[PDB]
Amino acid sequence: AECSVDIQGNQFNTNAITVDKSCKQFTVNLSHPGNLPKNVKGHNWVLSTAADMQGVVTDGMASGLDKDYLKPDDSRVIAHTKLIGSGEKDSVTFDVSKLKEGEQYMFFCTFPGHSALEKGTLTLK
Numbered sequence: 174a175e176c177s178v179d180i181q182g183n184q185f186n187t188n189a190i191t192v193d194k195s196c197k198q199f200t201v202n203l204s205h206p207g208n209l210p211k212n213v214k215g216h217n218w219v220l221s222t223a224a225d226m227q228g229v230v231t232d233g234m235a236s237g238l239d240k241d242y243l244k245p246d247d248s249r250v251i252a253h254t255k256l257i258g259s260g261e262k263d264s265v266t267f268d269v270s271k272l273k274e275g276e277q278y279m280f281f282c283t284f285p286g287h288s289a290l291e292k293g294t295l296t297l298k
């Protein structure tokens with residue numbers, strides 16, 4: 174099965190990612206659609222459990238641009254890309270051993286305000 178997915182904003186281009194349970198690693202390739210720099214309007218892709226999302230997003234906003242809008246040493250973050258701006262791309266590869274069938278995961282952007290629209294479910298199946 175395939176073990177990668179391409180994601181970009183148009184809102185993400187998908188609101189549901191499925192990871193095949195035979196994948197040992199999974200890769201997300203994020204690209205930035207727009208013409209603004211990352212300090213003005215950046216994007217990232219961040220994965221956590223559904224329950225942990227709000228905490229990751231809220232603490233991330235508080236931590237600010239210098240920290241890529243993530244709280245340092247946030248153990249709730251399962252995987253993430255860096256924050257990117259216009260013309261940039263970033264990929265993250267993570268171990269599928271971090272995911273479990275039946276559990277609910279969310280992916281989202283933690284740039285301030287983006288997670289209302291830039292979010293989706295991730296499922297291991």
Ligand SMILES: [Cu+2]
Nearest residue numbers: 174175176195
């Ligand atoms: Cu395969």
Ligand SMILES: [Cu+2]
Nearest residue numbers: 174175195196
């Ligand atoms: Cu395979």
Ligand SMILES: [Cu+2]
Nearest residue numbers: 216282284287
């Ligand atoms: Cu964003």
